[PDB]
Design a protein around this ligand. Sequence first.
Ligand SMILES: *[C@@H]1O[C@H](CO)[C@@H](O[C@@H]2O[C@H](CO)[C@@H](O[C@@H]3O[C@H](CO[C@@H]4O[C@H](CO)[C@@H](O)[C@H](O)[C@@H]4O)[C@@H](O)[C@H](O)[C@@H]3O)[C@H](O)[C@H]2NC(C)=O)[C@H](O)[C@H]1NC(C)=O
Ligand SMILES: *[C@@H]1O[C@H](CO)[C@@H](O[C@@H]2O[C@H](CO)[C@@H](O)[C@H](O)[C@H]2NC(C)=O)[C@H](O)[C@H]1NC(C)=O
Ligand SMILES: CNC(=O)[C@H](Cc1c[nH]c2ccccc12)NC(=O)[C@@H](CC(=O)NO)CC(C)C
Ligand SMILES: *[C@@H]1O[C@H](CO)[C@@H](O)[C@H](O)[C@H]1NC(C)=O
Ligand SMILES: *[C@@H]1O[C@H](CO)[C@@H](O)[C@H](O)[C@H]1NC(C)=O
Ligand SMILES: [Ca+2]
Ligand SMILES: [Ca+2]
Ligand SMILES: [Ca+2]
Ligand SMILES: [Ca+2]
Ligand SMILES: [Ca+2]
Ligand SMILES: [Zn+2]
Lengths: 120, 416, 129
Amino acid sequence: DCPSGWLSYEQHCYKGFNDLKNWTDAEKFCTEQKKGSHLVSLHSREEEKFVVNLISENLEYPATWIGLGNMWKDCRMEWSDRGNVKYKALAEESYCLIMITHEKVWKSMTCNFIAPVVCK
Amino acid sequence: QFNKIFIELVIIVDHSMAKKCNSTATNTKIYEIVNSANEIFNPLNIHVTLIGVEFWCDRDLINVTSSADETLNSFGEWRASDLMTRKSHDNALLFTDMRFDLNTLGITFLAGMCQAYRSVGIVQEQGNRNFKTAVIMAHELSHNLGMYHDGKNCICNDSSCVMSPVLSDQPSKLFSNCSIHDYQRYLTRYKPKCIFNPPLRKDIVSPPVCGNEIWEEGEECDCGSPANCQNPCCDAATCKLKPGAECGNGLCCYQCKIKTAGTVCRRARDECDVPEHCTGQSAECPRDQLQQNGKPCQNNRGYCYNGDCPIMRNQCISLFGSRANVAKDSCFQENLKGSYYGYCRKENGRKIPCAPQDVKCGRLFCLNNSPRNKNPCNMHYSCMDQHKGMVDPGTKCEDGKVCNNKRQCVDVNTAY
Amino acid sequence: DCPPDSSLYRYFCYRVFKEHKTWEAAERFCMEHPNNGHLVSIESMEEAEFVAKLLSNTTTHFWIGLMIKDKEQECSSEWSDGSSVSYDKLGKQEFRKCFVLEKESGYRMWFNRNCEERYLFVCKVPPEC
Ligand SMILES: *[C@@H]1O[C@H](CO)[C@@H](O[C@@H]2O[C@H](CO)[C@@H](O[C@@H]3O[C@H](CO[C@@H]4O[C@H](CO)[C@@H](O)[C@H](O)[C@@H]4O)[C@@H](O)[C@H](O)[C@@H]3O)[C@H](O)[C@H]2NC(C)=O)[C@H](O)[C@H]1NC(C)=O
Ligand SMILES: *[C@@H]1O[C@H](CO)[C@@H](O[C@@H]2O[C@H](CO)[C@@H](O)[C@H](O)[C@H]2NC(C)=O)[C@H](O)[C@H]1NC(C)=O
Ligand SMILES: CNC(=O)[C@H](Cc1c[nH]c2ccccc12)NC(=O)[C@@H](CC(=O)NO)CC(C)C
Ligand SMILES: *[C@@H]1O[C@H](CO)[C@@H](O)[C@H](O)[C@H]1NC(C)=O
Ligand SMILES: *[C@@H]1O[C@H](CO)[C@@H](O)[C@H](O)[C@H]1NC(C)=O
Ligand SMILES: [Ca+2]
Ligand SMILES: [Ca+2]
Ligand SMILES: [Ca+2]
Ligand SMILES: [Ca+2]
Ligand SMILES: [Ca+2]
Ligand SMILES: [Zn+2]
């Protein structure tokens, strides 16, 4: 059982928003919304298809940020010449994940992008 | 003149020449080439004593390609990993039929005599033109003793000395003005220790020859040719002892009489050497033996190795001068890349990176503190001389550990 | 030194090609005729400056030789809530696991790009001897 506005599924609470904003703002946002809230997480196509319809019914835009940001910035690396990677110079730009309603798949997009949020 | 020098040589006959694996004929050709070589080296007091000969009848233990540079490199790494481990010797030559590119007849490393990976040389056998082959062998061994090619004004009586960059159809048997000087310079600089005492007569495999200034089995003595012999107790011709003399040559011979037993015939050169005393039964000093490999040396700054005490700092000085020293570990990490200069072992010319535990055995990096610099990781590399620059095998890579002859930082107790 | 067609920096030579290739292709091309070659590695701020000056000295984006390990798409990242990444449906073509240098950034910033995209590159080869 979830509060007003929020829909329930399995054991969590969901809530779509049209307030378009970048990944970080979308995250900090979800937290301020409710203690323990973060961008939606998806551990199965089942939960996914649920969040999909939640969007289609409540939200205008056919997509939302999900919950993964700065995707390939803190990985284990190495140069092709087998040399070690001590020195780093990773640009501030970075990729985050978004889910498109229709094709219901995941796309990578610069976290700069402005999209609708779907807390949980 | 020069001090008597002896090169304990081992010759390798590759599959090419090993086709008709049948020895006999080959050895005869070899013995004559060698003897001829000594006849060339006489005026320099250099004596090459053949203490071994191997045949590669089965296969070629290393790929003998058309590239003389490639083959030598491969041969050098083999001579260090295989041969040296099995048989003890100073230098090693590989005799082949192989028609190398660029018309080359022989190749070796500069001032490499005594060095594990670089005391090697390649020689293309000129069929049965034995003497023309001897010149090549001489031309190389000399390059290995710091001798360069004859330039603008280097003279000899034949107008075509041994060190000419081009082998004439009737090569001289004389060394040049420049060569003599280059050699003298080699000795006062590299100070080779592995070429001072000859091998026991017992171990020389070449058929005895009187007058070759090489006391061999069957010879009563040998002060060389009657021409340049100053031995009051040896027959310059018949290699026989004069009237009242027990010996002619040997560390255990004095005033022409066999030294008494218990008398030291060969002291210990360094801390990595063990003295030898006369048996009293022969004028020939017993086989030279060095300290037990592994034994600490230089106040635990290293561990003995076939007579020497290799230490990274010194090898850095050899390469970059008195102002040089070993670089900070950080540099040796370049040896993991398996770069063109940063690697350890090589397989078929292919450079293999070092396991994180053997980085102190690949390319040596020095901190040459000489102005104009900007690189704290100096290293030596030449595609024609890649082994020089690598950490000398025997070196101490860590407390209780040393590099073996296979670019590995193994445990001293297990390396010996 | 190396006067084949590149610049020299501490024992290595940097050649710059104008052929558009994929990361995979570039690396593969860096280690063929220009033997031992590889895509530029940048191990220090000094070398970083060097490669930049080189690219600036040029008359698009360039392939850095940096690559990712571990067979995990997300690497070590997890959902913002804390849960591990159970379900994963990010199409492969959505990955941006390679890195390039770009003029806008002064050739001193590493940006993620699809390893399949075709950009310019710079090999770090050995010197002539
Ligand atoms: C997602 O969007 C957010 C906001 O839209 C981006 O965050 C913003 O990032 C910039 C830096 O690129 C911050 O600017 C700095 O501001 C400080 C002054 O402090 C701030 O001042 C503003 C008003 O001036 C206040 O509203 C803030 O609360 C705070 O006090 C200044 O000293 C710096 O020189 C610099 O200009 C900006 O403050 C920040 N906005 C906030 C408050 O979130 C974010 O970059 C972007 N991220 C992604 C995923 O691209
Ligand atoms: C070997 O001897 C030759 C000649 O005996 C030396 O060469 C001479 O070099 C001087 C340099 O000033 C010339 O002017 C002479 O003409 C050269 N001699 C001739 C006529 O050939 C040579 O220097 C000697 N080798 C060395 C360097 O020891
Ligand atoms: C016929 N083969 C050879 O003797 C060639 C000849 C050669 C070299 N440069 C040339 C340019 C024009 C024509 C021929 C040659 N030279 C060699 O093999 C010499 C190689 C060398 O420098 N060894 O240290 C070692 C040798 C002197 C014993
Ligand atoms: C070179 O010789 C080695 C044996 O020492 C062999 O394994 C290798 O295959 C040879 N090279 C080639 C490519 O045939
Ligand atoms: C590269 O830069 C150097 C000076 O930094 C300059 O001399 C050279 O001409 C430049 N390359 C070319 C060919 O423009
Ligand atoms: Ca003599
Ligand atoms: Ca010896
Ligand atoms: Ca003799
Ligand atoms: Ca001794
Ligand atoms: Ca967790
Ligand atoms: Zn030569």
